Structure formats: C-alpha cells, structure tokens
Amino acid sequence: PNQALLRILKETEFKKIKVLGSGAFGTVYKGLWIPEGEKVKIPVAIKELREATSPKANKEILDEAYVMASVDNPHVCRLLGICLTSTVQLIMQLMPFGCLLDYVREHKDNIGSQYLLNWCVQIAKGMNYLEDRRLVHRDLAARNVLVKTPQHVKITDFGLAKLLVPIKWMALESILHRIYTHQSDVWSYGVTVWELMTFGSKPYDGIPASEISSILEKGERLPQPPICTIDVYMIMRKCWMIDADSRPKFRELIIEFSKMARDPQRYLVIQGDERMHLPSPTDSNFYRALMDEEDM
C-alpha cells in the first residue's frame, strides 16, 4: 500500500451538502472539497459512519483504507481520502448518476440488451480484479455498483470483512457460517445480475430473511427473469450452487458474458429492443470527454 494514494483531510477542507442515502454502516452525502488557497468548490461524496472511533479503533480503519485506496482498475472505485474525527468520514468520487439499482428502476423496460449485457461484463471484470488483489467484496449488490456513465459502471464499498446483514444476496455458506470468499462473492454476483435483468425487483420479496437459508436448503432459487434466455438463466443458477467450488469463476463469467454481448439480441429478448437507444459512438465520446477520461 503506497500511502500517498490516501489523502488525509482536515475538517476545514470539505462540507457536507445534502444526504444521498444510508446503509448498514453509514450515511452518504453530496459534498464539496475546497483545495487550500483556491476559490473552487469540487463535488465529492462523503460517507460518515454511524459508530464513533478511538485511535486504536482508527488504526484498524487506516490500515484498511490504505488497501482500498490502492485499487487500480477501470471497473472498481477507489477510496480517495479520509477525515479522522470523533466519527470517521470517507471521501470518494461523487457519481451524479448514482447507483445501478436506481438507474435500472428509473429506466425500467427502457434499457436495451446491449447495455444490460455490457454491465454484467463490467461488474465481472471489476470483481475479477478484486480477486486478483485477493480482496473479498462481501457486500456486492446492484446498490453497490455505481454508474459513472450509462456505458461505464463501477464496483464500490468492497472489502469490509477484516473490520467486522445482506441475507438475500449472501451465499448459503456465508449465512450459516459467516464464510466470505470469492466464491460466495460469485453468489452475490448471480443475485446482482438477477436485479439487472428484472430492472430492480427485490429478491425473494414475499419471503422474510429469517427463512432464506431454509428455502435454499430446499433447493429453491430466484425465478427466471422474463427477458432472459435459458443460457443467461443457467449462468445465474450456476452461481447459486450449494458447492462453492462448483460455481463459475469470475474469469469465466467475463468470457461468457462478453461472448453474449457480441450478439445481445440472441441472449436477451426485450420487447421493442429496437425502441431502445444503444451506445452511440458519438454519445460515448461525448460522455467520456466530458465526465469519464480514465484510461480503460
């Protein structure tokens, strides 16, 4: 961990503007960074954790924050900065589009097959990269994929296991034994893709979280999303095998979905898939030069 990658912030160089949402461990705000000696106001996203901290407690956090500021992959968000006060604040890039879960709801049945497949590929590439860095996500879900542009999504909020519940995204072995590996991350990938293919349906909606390990024992799984051809649905089911080692690997999921992305209409069936927009190269260039210059 090159410690120059994590910028330590004083309270005086940023301000919280507005609340974006909250989750298990914190609250996310629209923020503004003020570089010292300048008059510019730079938008940032700030997460403040619910529970306070001591310098001994902070030593564990800094040690991990250094690891998450060291990721370097186009499909993985990296921690940028931190402010250690009574409560801890974490700073990353603010994404105006927000998370992919809200984006598929906002455009429900208004999203073509080229986009959904492209996203699956991209989430897989980012998860594979974390695996190569030997980082377990532990909380992969559509709410933790961020839309940088409609053509470019990024994984966020990974790596919290060595500092510590999303039952309906969790593998059977994680529910029963708090076992988190990359293969249980592969389970949450399967659930994430099911979210995309349903435009943000809630998984196991009538079924309380208390009962989830029973129904997975019984062999029940999430139903096949209407737009999914069988080939796509069995990748999802392969991700939900009892035997973690029988699940697909993230390198395999990249090859597979990127093969389906080459003829998207063969693998998903969307009504008026020709009503749908598709990523114009003119549109893609404009988005990249304006808000997405990173190297890919």
Add this chain to the structure above:
Amino acid sequence: QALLRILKETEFKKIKVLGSGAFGTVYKGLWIPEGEKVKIPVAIKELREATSPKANKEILDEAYVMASVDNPHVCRLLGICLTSTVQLIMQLMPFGCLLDYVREHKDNIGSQYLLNWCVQIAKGMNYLEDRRLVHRDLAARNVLVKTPQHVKITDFGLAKLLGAEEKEYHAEGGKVPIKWMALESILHRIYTHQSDVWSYGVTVWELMTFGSKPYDGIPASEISSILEKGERLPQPPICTIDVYMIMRKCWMIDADSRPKFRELIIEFSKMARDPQRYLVIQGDERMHLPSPTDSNFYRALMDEED
C-alpha cells in the same frame, strides 16, 4: 465526425457569463442528456455574429478538426449547436484561464509552477504544429487550468474561418490580437507556426509578469512601428538573462530564425529541473509545490486523463 456531437438546443442551457473576447461570449452551463435526470456542467461559447447556413457548413468542417485533437495539453471541441448564432461546447474549467489564475495568485506562484507551465504550453503547441494546425490567437487567456499542475491550450484554428475579412480588420477594432502578433502577421494578416512562436514568447512574458498587459499604455495602432524600430517587451524582474533571451529569440524579425516549439520544450524542461537558478522570485523557498498525495487527489477528482 463521431468526435463532434451535433447538439439540440433543448439539451443544454446557459447559466452564467464567464467572459468574452473578439468573437464570442463564454458561459458556464449544463448539459442535460435526453431521458436522464443529470445536469452536467460544461462551458458554452456563443459567437457574437449570426451566420448563414453556408457559413455554418464551413464552421462545421473546421469544428471536426477542432474535435479531432487528442493531446494532454490541448483542449478539444466537444459539441456544436447550429443556432442562428452558433454555440460551442467544451469541458468547463473551474480554475478558469491561466491569465486570471496567475493574476489571482500573483504572490503565491513559485518557479517550478511557472516553468512547468512553459513546458506544457510548448508541448501542446508542438502537437498542433505536428498536426499542422496554426493557432492564430495564443495568449495566456487561451490557456486553461485543468488543475494548477495541468494547463491546456484552447481556442486554436480560427484563421480559415476569418480569411474573408481578416485583411480588413482594424488594429483598434479588437478583432486582431495585435500585441501578441508577429510583425509579419500585423503587416500581412497571415499566421504560421513561426508567428505562433512569437505569441508563445508574449504568453511566457505574461506568465513571468504574473499577468501584466503587454505594451501597456501603447495604442495597438503604434505596435508595428515600435517593433520595426527594434523595441520589445521589457525583461520581467523575475527572469534571469537566460529566460529573457529565449523570449527575445521568439521575437526576431526573421520568422525562420525564431526557436521551434520542439526546442522550446527541451530548453524549458532543462530549466524546470533547476528552477531557482533561472527565475528569481520573492519567497520562492516557501512557495507551494504539490506532493504526490495532493496531486493524486486532484487527478481523481477532476483530471483523470493524466
């Protein structure tokens, strides 16, 4: 052609004037992509004069070249709207142009920053020369600050669009940038890579003076005569003779005798490795230079192209 977005009037709005010059007014604005809920800040330039559709076809031909540049020290044109007065879209620079930046930080700019800026501007101009694009209007106001460590050339390439009227422009009519121009350009209204080198000389002079107006108090009417007599801009107090002589070389009468952008890169890169030897600045020992932690932060938040 994919590199220039042809825009609809409905997908952007002007919000605030940022400034104006010879041919247009610049606004801070918002791009609102169709069918989305996001408002993306952008800079919008509206030209002062309305254009016919035939004039627009010419403008569009040049706009495609202006959108084709791809270099970390040259800004590219992003979109165009063919409104009655043409509107032009590029990235919005929160720090503004370098002229206003050096004026606002006149007491906190050290020799590393100034020399690095000279290198970067030379790099961008040499890319334009390699692409055989003439600037015609290089000046500190047409260098933008992406971050204090990363400056970029803007607003090049207009010469062909002005060719019909260029010879008629009055020295006092503010359409022809007399105090940045080579002598042969004032007399003949033709612009080349070597006359751009002269503007570069003036641009560097602006930076070394933290934004003084060149030939201040002298009407533009009289510039051609004082140059023909051998007069030039004075030596900025912070410049050693080494730096002043490069500047004076950019203002030699014979265009072919001036330095090349290729060589200016090398010379300013050499000085940038020992800045306090070549620029004498009050408080330079204390002046800020950016640690890797702060440059990394800057790049992730607003300058990912690196």
